Amino acid sequence: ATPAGPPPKNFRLPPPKNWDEESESTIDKVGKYFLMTEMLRGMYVLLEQFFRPPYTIYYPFEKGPISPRFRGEH
């Protein structure tokens, strides 16, 4: 696996943290669990996409961009 020679400095992971070592408050951890917090953020991000200009062009009235080097029919 790892490169030959001295092993990478701090390649060994720190020892695992216990349940009572995680430094998150119970009110925050339980709040995030029950309030579905991270997924409300994702819902919101879709909302601001909803109020952004669309990317769509109206083919064939509008055409996408092609270069001089474009290769079409002979």
Ligand X SMILES: CCCCCCCCCCCCCCCCCC(=O)OC[C@H](COP(=O)(O)OCCN)OC(=O)CCCCCCCCCCCCCCCCC
Decide if residue 30 touches another protein (CB under 8 A).
yes
Q: In angstroms, give the least distance from the CB of 38 to another protein.
A: 15
Question: Which stretches of the chain are DSSP H helices?
Answer: 26-35, 37-50
How far is 24 from 45, CA to CA, in rounded Å? Answer: 25
68 alpha carbon, distance to own chain's centre: 36
Decide if residue 33 touches another protein (CB under 8 A).
yes
Residues between 18 and 37 that touch ligand X (CB under 6 A): 30, 33-34, 36
In this structure, which amino acid lies at residue 21? E
- 2 touches 8 (CB < 8 A): yes
Which residue, 20 or 62, has its beta carbon nearer to another protein? Answer: 20
Where does this chain bind ligand X (CB under 6 A)?
Answer: 30, 33-34, 36
Where does this chain bind another protein (CB under 8 A)?
Answer: 18-20, 22, 26, 29-30, 33-34
